[PDB]
């Protein structure tokens, strides 16, 4: 699934191809600056080496003048200056070449992404709703975001760096074969293992910043499951099993992190073993050859360094072909969507333009099936006609044909057979923009955009004036609530704004359809879940709108069926009944059945968190000082093995000293490998132990605390799963890794600066004045290797939510044909970070160039001052090479070490968050074993004047002195109205809160002083919606009484009292049938019966029943009432309801308003007193 190479660049102009063709040449010319730098370095060490032999021969002639030791050395001093001009040439000619190398690829692949992004969104918006029905929406949004980010990183800067690495490879081997070839063939014999190890280490390096959420995701699903529903967990006493369930998978994630750390650090250590063993082999053969008088030391240094950097550049050129290997696969997923052509093509403008439209119509034998649900044909052979003004309504079967024709009128689908024709004119030859311009519709559930009021009317038409808008909102009967508005039509309305009512959004949606000025008005179920006090005025408003339009109303409240003109009825997808109201009354068909039925950092504390694993930290830092101290050992051994050749000696003394120093290279290589492996392993283990233990401790101290903490919107399931998923692995990088960084860098530069003040100080003051810029060179090159592109993608979020906001409610936009407003809304919000990214590319190119230019001018200045200082006999050449090697290669090493570790500032703010979570303690401590723990079994709950307000808002006092007493055994029910909070005392019985004034007298005892685990041990709760888990049904049912020894037989018993028992026996793998997204999905009544059986496992003394409406099965009501009547006999129940089929067998019903009982008594008393109960029976009786 990938595209060819000549297709990804097909969205480039000619300036982009010019930018890429200049960036390739700048990549190749930047490629061969380092082998030429090694060539001039070899020629310079050859000059310095040849002069030294002559010094001693001269030294034994005592009468020799000072001008003599000037002439040989004068010649040395003069030659050095020409090579200083060579180095300044390479530096100032790699400055501008690296600037053209970086800036002309980020530009030329930010421009292509900025084209492809808006062309992709435009290709999405111009699609069929039938194609949109098949594909997902979240998959498509994630496809947009991550796929365009992958195409941005795939061609962005990786290809220029690939060309640079390949050019450095070829330049290294050309210099190695034309300067001296025997040593080049010897190093090329071990070239493939060198390149293999460098390729593995480069793959390790480029994939460093990666979160690896694949080990944790089992526990992540556990956390996002349990923290999504926390009120159930506290009620059923589910602590120890939940923590064990977390703990085992957490141990597995710990083991996988262990193996990943050991593999990564052995893959780093083997590279340094190969580096130092290659140094030993090449200098052993190089001083076998230079003592035979064949090469010089200059040619050995040059061909060795150039062949080595060639092999390591083909090492590092592998992930920059990996990124282009998978961007080829991502571009297929984008280009296939932008390639497709819609059959209707709602942006094309070719059809007819009718005028003087009134709305005549003819259904002609339409045979239609869904393209998604292919196997069933819903409509066939339909024939319906209308004339002007004739308000036709249709009633019949549920959901089959009530929506398919209201969708076919906007041409959301083509008919597979038949041809609907508007006004004797074809529906598929009108311009589809014009066809959807003349037809308005109001949806069943109106969705509203998170913008102002006036801008929501602006989507009706973009040429409307505010006078028309004001006369429309007064015209559509909407002005009463909207004149109680805060300021004006700029009022923020939405799910993040003022949470409005359904009828208000409904009537503003019909108001938008009125500003559209429709000609064939359509209405489909404008009273889905609307109250009776608002359905009258919205019916009045749409009845004002009905005069003059070919209206089709398909809704509930079957009373305006009388006022409608012509009715029709669905019969198997063929509508055959047609007539007026009384004609349908005398037809005596389905309509007779209808009228029969209805009518602070603190770094010592972060280490103090790890005070148990100090036998790992001791060997860790004792290993890290050794591993970060062998860079000055390499400097001293390199300086001595070169300074053995700028002095005159025997042949055999030179031979055995060279053999000794090659042996010391190999010993340093093995010691560096061992110390990298152990510094990796021990800090890896002492990091993963803290991640496991801190995740377990934060989960235990997060599960424990009160219910009010979960009520603030800064403690959500998403935020807590982030601060539990992402933060243990960010406190692991502020205890161990920071100590490793400080100790490696303090050895690696303290030893270097101390011995380089011992040997020669007039040079090391200069190099210590240069050192910060080359340390910054190391850190910005290491930023370039992995983490450069990752930051920018978090900034683009203005267009990150417009696309997901306008792709979710795609049906509203396609009904409105207002795609161009959303496309320009995407366009300008994309236009600003494009300019910001171009400025960031022009900054990053010049900083990455200037650091390299200072890296080569360090060579220039250091060796010129070193030659002057040698030519007056106060430093040798080996001491200048030692000072340079220490106080340059140490600065690059502390740059790479200080950037290779994770960050500290994010680590310490994450540590402050975890330390401020895990130590705080609520007042209602759910783990307090203290209390009375009595032996009560009757359960007289007595309220006395409870005054309560929620801590999320103190602005509405909701309880004002409630006194309520329940008698033993009876089913005391409580029903009210909207906004009253019917379940507040229900939650207060389990002490989910604590009221301010008043108390609960549970047999004369306050719930403040009891033992909470005893109270949860004799209490069962029924929820509105059940909460189901990823376990068996035996433990989903057996969840009702935790911390117990419940066995198979009580699950069988609770299945007897459930009437799901033979339904379980009808299923295979009876109790083992796992439920979830990995299992089956049940109806509302069956999941309700699951909840009732789960609560009735406990066999409690008091039950609590909390039920809500809007079930759609509505046939299991009798069976859930018979299980409740099995529970309404010896178990004290508290009942709220919305279905009023329980108001006769409920014992003591209470009217609740103003926090006070209106009246005590039974049903006939409170119904004969003509209170609010009279109003509910009078509403639901009509």
């Amino acid at each position: 699934p990938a595209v060819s190479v000549l297709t990804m660049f097909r969205y480039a102009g000619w300036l982009d191809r010019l930018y890429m063709l200049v960036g390739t040449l700048a990549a190749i010319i930047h490629g061969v600056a380092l082998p030429l730098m090694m060539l001039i370095f070899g020629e310079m060490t050859d000059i310095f080496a040849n002069a030294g032999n002559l010094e001693d021969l001269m030294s034994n002639i005592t009468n020799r003048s000072d001008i003599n030791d000037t002439g040989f050395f004068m010649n040395l001093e003069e030659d050095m200056t020409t090579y200083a001009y060579y180095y300044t040439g390479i530096g100032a000619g790699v400055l501008i070449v690296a600037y053209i190398q970086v800036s002309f690829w980020c530009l030329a692949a930010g421009r292509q992404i900025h084209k492809i992004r808006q062309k992709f969104f435009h290709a999405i918006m111009n699609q069929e709703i039938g194609w949109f029905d098949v594909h997902d929406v979240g998959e498509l949004n994630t496809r947009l975001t991550d796929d365009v980010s992958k195409i941005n990183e795939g061609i962005g800067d990786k290809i220029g760096m690939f060309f640079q690495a390949m050019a450095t490879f070829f330049g290294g081997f050309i210099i190695g074969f034309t300067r001296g070839w025997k040593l080049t063939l010897v190093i090329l014999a071990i070239s493939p293992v060198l390149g293999l190890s460098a390729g593995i280490w480069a793959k390790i390096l480029s994939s460093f910043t990666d979160k690896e959420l694949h080990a944790y995701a089992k526990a992540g699903a556990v956390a996002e499951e349990v923290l999504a529903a926390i009120r159930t967990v506290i009620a059923f006493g589910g602590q120890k099993k939940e923590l064990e369930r977390y703990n085992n998978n957490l141990e597995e994630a710990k083991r996988l992190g262990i193996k990943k750390a050991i593999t990564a650090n052995i893959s780093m250590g083997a590279a340094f073993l190969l580096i130092y063993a290659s140094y030993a082999l090449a200098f052993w053969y190089g001083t076998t050859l230079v003592l035979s008088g064949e090469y010089s030391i200059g040619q050995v240094l040059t061909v060795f360094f150039s062949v080595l950097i060639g092999a390591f550049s083909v090492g590092q050129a592998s992930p920059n072909i990996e990124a282009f290997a998978n961007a080829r696969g991502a571009a297929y997923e984008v280009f296939k969507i932008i390639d497709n052509k819609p059959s209707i093509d709602s942006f094309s403008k070719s059809g007819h333009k009718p005028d003087n439209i009134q709305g005549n119509l003819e259904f002609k034998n339409i045979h239609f099936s869904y393209p998604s649900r292919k196997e069933v044909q819903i409509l066939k052979g339909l024939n319906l006609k209308v004339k002007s003004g004739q308000t036709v309504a249709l009633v019949g079967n549920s959901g089959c044909g009530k929506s398919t024709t209201v969708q076919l009128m906007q041409r959301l689908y083509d008919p597979l057979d038949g041809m609907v024709s508007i006004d004797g004119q074809d529906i598929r030859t009108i311009n589809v923009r014009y066809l959807r311009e003349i037809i308005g519709v109001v949806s069943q559930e109106p969705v509203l955009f998170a913008t102002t009021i006036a801008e929501n009317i602006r989507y009706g038409r973009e040429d409307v004036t505010m006078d028309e808008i004001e006369k429309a909102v007064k015209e559509a009967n909407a002005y009463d609530f909207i004149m109680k508005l805060p300021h004006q039509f700029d009022t923020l309305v939405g799910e993040r704004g003022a949470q409005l009512s359904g009828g208000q959004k409904q009537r503003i949606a019909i108001a938008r359809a009125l500003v559209r000025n429709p000609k064939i008005l359509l209405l489909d179920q404008a009273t889905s879940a609307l109250d009776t006090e608002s359905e009258a005025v919205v019916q009045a408003a749409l009845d004002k709108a009905r005069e003059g339009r070919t209206t089709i109303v398909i809704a509930h409240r079957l009373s305006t069926v009388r006022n409608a003109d012509v009715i029709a009825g669905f019969d198997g997808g063929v509508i055959v009944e047609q007539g007026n109201h009384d004609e349908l009354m005398r037809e005596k068909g389905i309509y007779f059945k209808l009228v029969m039925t209805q009518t602070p950092a603190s770094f010592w504390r972060i280490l103090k968190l790890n005070s148990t694993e100090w036998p790992y930290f001791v060997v860790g830092i004792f290993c890290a000082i050794i591993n970060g101290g062998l860079q000055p050992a390499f400097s001293v051994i390199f300086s001595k093995i070169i300074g053995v050749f700028t002095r005159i000696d025997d042949p055999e003394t030179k031979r055995q000293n060279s053999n000794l120093f090659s042996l010391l290279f190999l010993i340093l290589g093995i010691i560096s490998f061992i110390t990298f492996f152990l510094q990796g392993f021990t800090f890896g283990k002492a990091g993963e132990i803290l991640t496991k233990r801190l995740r377990y401790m934060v989960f235990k101290s997060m599960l424990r605390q009160d219910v009010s903490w979960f009520d603030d919107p800064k403690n959500t399931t998403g935020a807590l799963t982030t601060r539990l998923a992402n933060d243990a692995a960010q406190v692991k990088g502020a205890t161990g890794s920071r100590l490793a960084v400080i100790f490696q860098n303090i050895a690696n530069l303290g030893t270097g600066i101390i011995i380089s003040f011992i040997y020669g100080w007039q040079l090391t003051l200069l190099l210590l004045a240069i050192v910060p810029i080359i340390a910054i060179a190391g850190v910005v090159e290491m930023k370039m290797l992995s983490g450069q592109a990752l930051k920018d993608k978090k900034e683009l979020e203005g267009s990150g939510k417009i696309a997901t906001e306008a792709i979710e409610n795609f049906r509203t936009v396609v009904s409105l044909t207002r795609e161009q407003k959303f496309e320009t809304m995407y366009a300008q919000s994309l236009q600003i970070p494009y300019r910001n990214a171009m400025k960031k590319a022009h900054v990053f190119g010049i900083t990455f160039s200037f650091t390299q230019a200072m890296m080569y001018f360090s060579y220039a200045a250091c060796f010129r001052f070193g030659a002057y200082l040698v030519a007056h006999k106060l430093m040798s050449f080996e001491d200048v090479l030692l000072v340079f090697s220490a106080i340059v290669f140490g600065a690059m090493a502390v740059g790479q070490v200080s950037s290779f570790a994770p960050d500290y500032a994010k680590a310490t703010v994450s540590a402050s968050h975890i330390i401020r979570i895990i130590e705080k303690t609520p007042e209602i401590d759910s783990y307090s074993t203290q209390g009375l723990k009595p032996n009560m079994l009757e359960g007289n709950v007595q309220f006395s004047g409870v005054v309560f307000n929620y801590p999320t808002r103190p602005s509405i006092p909701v309880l004002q002195g409630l006194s309520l007493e329940v008698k033993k055994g009876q089913t005391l029910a409580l029903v009210g109205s909207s906004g009253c909070g019917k379940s507040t005392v229900v939650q207060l019985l389990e002490r989910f809160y604590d009221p301010m004034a008043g108390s609960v007298f549970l047999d004369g005892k306050e719930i403040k002083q009891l033992n909470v685990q005893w109270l949860r041990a004799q209490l069962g709760i029924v929820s509105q919606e059940p909460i189901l888990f990823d376990c068996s049904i035996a433990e989903n049912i057996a969840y009702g009484d935790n911390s117990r020894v419940v066995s198979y037989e009580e699950i069988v018993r609770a299945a007897k009292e459930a009437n799901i028992h033979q339904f379980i026996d009808s299923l295979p793998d009876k109790y083992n049938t796992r439920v979830g997204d990995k299992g089956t999905q049940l109806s509302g009544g069956q999941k309700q019966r699951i909840a009732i059986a789960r609560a009735l496992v406990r066999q409690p003394h008091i039950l609590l029943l909390d039920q809500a409406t809007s079930a759609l099965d509505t046939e299991s009501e009798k069976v859930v009432q018979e299980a409740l009547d099995k529970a309404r006999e010896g178990r004290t129940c508290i009942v709220i309801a919305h279905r009023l089929s329980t108001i006769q067998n409920a014992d003591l019903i209470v009217v609740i308003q103003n926090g006070k009982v209106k009246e005590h008594g039974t049903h006939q008393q409170l119904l004969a007193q003509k209170g609010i109960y009279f109003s509910m029976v009078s509403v639901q009786a009509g």
Partner: antibody
Amino acid sequence: EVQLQESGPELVKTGASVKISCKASGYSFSNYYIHWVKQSHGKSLEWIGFISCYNGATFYNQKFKGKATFTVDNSSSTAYMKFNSLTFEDSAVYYCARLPIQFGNFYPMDYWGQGTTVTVSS
Amino acid sequence: QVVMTQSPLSLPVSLGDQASISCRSSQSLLHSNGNTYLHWYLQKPGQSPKLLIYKVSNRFSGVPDRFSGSGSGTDFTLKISRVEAEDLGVYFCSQSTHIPPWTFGGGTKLDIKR
């Protein structure tokens, strides 16, 4: 095979200057020194001087300072002395021999030129 | 200058036995290293002087095993063993380890012993 070999025999008059060449051939010419020595008729070999053979930094004997001057040619791999200010005493046989540069003075002159004679006439 | 004095002026050697040449310095050729440098060249008539014995005890790569050096301090000796007709030249002994006069020895011809 290492082989230094030299010019032909001269028959020069008194007062003129002569150039005599030592064409080193068979090795890497840019390391080793080149030492020019002089043998009279039946006497001990004296030593005249050497050249650095990489950058042309020369050193003469005490007696032969001024009335000799060496020059290199790295392209053709030869070495010359242009022997000015002739007398009768400078009729001899002149040799060239090489000394390695990494460990000179602690190594013998391992290969010698064949030597060719200079005959001062009057 | 170590005023070297190789002191046979000729050597009436027969054909097929042992010969022995001196080489006598004028200041001791022991360096600060534990090594004594003086080398031994054969010069055939007309051709180029070859190398035969260097660093008095050693032996150059290529020369046959008939040659052998000896001596230390200020008295040295080369020893032909069973001389053929091919070894008839003149032998001299560089060097000075106190450079740069870089002295050489006198020379010693051979004979056929009539």
